Design a protein around this ligand. Structure first.
Ligand SMILES: COc1ccc(S(=O)(=O)N(Cc2cccnc2)[C@@H](C(=O)NO)C(C)C)cc1
Ligand SMILES: [Ca+2]
Ligand SMILES: [Zn+2]
Ligand SMILES: [Zn+2]
Length: 157
């Protein structure tokens, strides 16, 4: 399935103590801009009511069929675009998140999780952010394969 609406809303359930909210909001807001900058889609944060995309951080087992197994395993995951828990996105909080080319990068994982909510499947292109495993690349930018793909679904800005 896909979102038939041209506008989407998202909301953060809570911010992790690892980093403040101003820094995390920037990372999450920046990712939406990268997708909106190449697509007529629009995003808006809501402080009340249900949001199309819910973002929250979890640890160890959190009432899910895919509990995290220590720092190894998946670093994050999300549910297919659907009602109820569908569209929700969980982030592994057992690892330390940073705001720069440090060990891990939150904005980068945020950009990938959003791609899954947009209905984008994984790709085999090295320059594609939708890399199957977690790999360190260079700058965070959308690849032509991702731009052509999302644009093909909706259209060009
Ligand atoms: C920067 O983009 C990334 C975001 C998350 C990850 S992830 O390690 O959590 N992971 C990839 C994975 C791990 C182990 C075995 N098979 C697959 C999920 C994935 O591909 N998420 O996008 C998947 C298993 C739920 C990796 C890269
Ligand atoms: Ca992990
Ligand atoms: Zn989870
Ligand atoms: Zn993925």
């Amino acid at each position: 399935p896909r979102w038939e609406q041209t506008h989407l809303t998202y909301r953060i359930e809570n911010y992790t103590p690892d980093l403040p909210r101003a820094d995390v909001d920037h990372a999450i807001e920046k990712a939406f801009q990268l997708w909106s900058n190449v697509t007529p889609l629009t995003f808006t944060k809501v402080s009340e009511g249900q949001a199309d995309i819910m973002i929250s951080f979890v640890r160890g087992d959190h009432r899910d069929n895919s509990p995290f197994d220590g720092p190894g395993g998946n670093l994050a995951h999300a549910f297919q675009p659907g009602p109820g828990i569908g569209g929700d996105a969980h982030f592994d909080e057992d690892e330390r998140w940073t705001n720069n080319f440090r060990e891990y990068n939150l904005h980068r994982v945020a950009a990938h999780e959003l791609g899954h909510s947009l209905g984008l499947s994984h790709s085999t292109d090295i320059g594609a952010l939708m890399y199957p495993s977690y790999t360190f690349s260079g700058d965070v930018q959308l690849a032509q394969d991702d731009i052509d793909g999302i644009q093909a679904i909706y259209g060009r800005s």
